[PDB]
């Protein structure tokens, strides 16, 4: 106590929906809720309860296979800010350069 | 019901602390807590309880005066994800291209 989190982001004019609609492949969705706990979803395939290092492995694998892959962070409206910063840092550590942020029911 | 929020972000290698430390001027901090309610802080000067359109006016004014200005979004660890997406969209609408995200006590 107390550790704070930070991340720098750039804001492009291109949109989250544009990224998804213009891509040949489904997006890879990193869903957050669970303190440092993630579900990775690609279409119907769900990889639940993954710890940070396993999310890095999964995401880095997909980015290497196709760097054009669209990555999204999904979560309920009330997911804590600190968890969102952690997730952005996690994705950047795995090599991801662009992310769509979206809230979900 | 139900409106969701989204924003696309790019992840540069440059950091939030780097942006602040390398700048000649203090950062402009948009603090969030309050549903669509913001405090804009520059050094000791606080502009509290600003509605979205007033934040846009204040931020756009500072960006026009100096486009090298460092903009930050500050908030407690538990600020809701949806409010963070709203704040990023608000800043981008005012012309801001880079933002540092940081949690605070
Ligand atoms: Na960063
Ligand atoms: Na793997
Ligand atoms: Na997280
Ligand atoms: Na966007
Ligand atoms: Na003004
Ligand atoms: Na907000």
Numbering used by the authors:
A (entry chain A), B (entry chain A): 37 to 141
From the paper:
Here, we present the 1.7-Å crystal structure of the intact periplasmic domain of E. coli TolR (TolR(36–142)). The final refined structure included residues 37–141, 161 solvent molecules, and 3 sodium ions. The monomer is composed of an N-terminal β-strand (β1 residues 41–47) and short α-helix (α1 residues 51–58) followed by a five-stranded mixed β-sheet (β2 residues 64–68; β3 residues 74–78; β4 residues 81–85; β5 residues 106–112, and β6 residues 133–139) sandwiched against two α-helices, α2 (residues 88–102) and α3 (residues 116–130). Close examination of TolR packing in the crystal revealed the presence of an intertwined dimer where the N-terminal β-strand of one subunit (β1) formed an anti-parallel β-sheet with the C terminus of a symmetry-related molecule (β6). The TolR(36–142) dimer interface is formed by residues from three regions as follows: the N terminus of the protein (residues 38–53 and 55), which includes β1 and part of α1; residues from the central regions of the protein that include β5 and α3 (residues 106, 108–118, 120–121, 124, and 127–128), and C-terminal β6 (residues 132–141). E. coli TolR(36–142) is also dimeric, but the architecture of the dimer is radically different from that of TolR(62–133) due to the intertwining of its N and C termini. TolR monomers are rotated ∼180° relative to each other as a result of this strand swapping, obliterating the putative PG-binding groove seen in TolR(62–133). In contrast, >2200 Å2 of accessible surface area is buried at the dimer interface of TolR(36–142), involving 44 residues from each monomer stabilized by 34 direct hydrogen bonds and 2 salt bridges. Truncated TolR (TolR(60–133)) bound PG but TolR(36–142) did not. Hence, this form of the stator protein likely represents the closed state of the pore, close to the membrane surface.
TolR is a 15-kDa inner membrane protein subunit of the Tol-Pal complex in Gram-negative bacteria, and its function is poorly understood. Tol-Pal is recruited to cell division sites where it is involved in maintaining the integrity of the outer membrane. TolR is related to MotB, the peptidoglycan (PG)-binding stator protein from the flagellum, suggesting it might serve a similar role in Tol-Pal. TolQ, TolR, and TolA are IM proteins that are coupled to the pmf through a conserved proton-conducting path, which is also found in MotA/MotB, ExbB/ExbD, and AglR/AglS.
